[PDB]
């Protein structure tokens, strides 16, 4: 605020209050495997090379 | 012949998965653009000529 | 000449490269650890993160 000279209206106090909010934006990516991959990952048939 | 009543068509190890074969003159499609999932029907229509 | 003088309007689209400035920590991002979800089938399984 700035003090006023003669003849000019003096300025009053003010209090200004504002609010802000967040936002959301999820992301997704898939990956897929074949049943043969899942079989051969666990199972070792007869152990050959 | 081994035939599948309810499931996918695949090898003993699911190492390969088979398709269903339709002779071309018997194939029907009725939309300009297909949706993701589409159901297959067999239709027999009788002409009374 | 027909007795009127028509004015034509059109828009042209231009392919543009942008330049973007932003100040240090102008915005704060908060994330959680990715969550993995399974979907199961006879022939493949798919994971959604």
Keywords:
part of a larger assembly, 3 chains, A: 49 residues, alpha+beta, 1 helix, B: little secondary structure, Major capsid protein (chain A), Triplex capsid protein 1 (chain B)
Shape of chain B: extended
What's the helical proportion of residues of chain A? 10-25%
Q: Work out the helicity level of chain B.
A: under 10%
Q: Please, what is the oligomeric state?
A: part of a larger assembly
Helical stretch count of chain B? 0
Count of DSSP helices of chain A? 1
SSE string of chain A, helices as H and strands as E: EH
Largest sheet of chain B: none
Report the end-to-end length of chain A measured between terminal Cα atoms: 86 Å
3D structure, described in words:
- This is part of a larger assembly, with 2 copies of chain A (49 residues) and 1 copy of chain B (49 residues).
- Chain A is of the alpha+beta class and 49 residues long.
- Chain A is built from 1 helix and 1 strand.
- Chain A is rod-shaped, with a radius of gyration of 36 Å.
- Chain B is extended, with a radius of gyration of 15 Å.
- Chain B is largely without helices or strands and 49 residues long.
- The N and C termini of chain B lie far apart (37 Å).
- At the A-C interface, strand 1 of A face strand 2 of C.
- Strand 1 of chain A pairs antiparallel with strand 2 of chain C, so a sheet runs across the interface.
- Chain B: Interacts with TRX2, MCP and capsid vertex component 2/CVC2.
- Chain B: Belongs to the herpesviridae TRX1 protein family.
- Chain B: It is found in: Virion; Host nucleus.
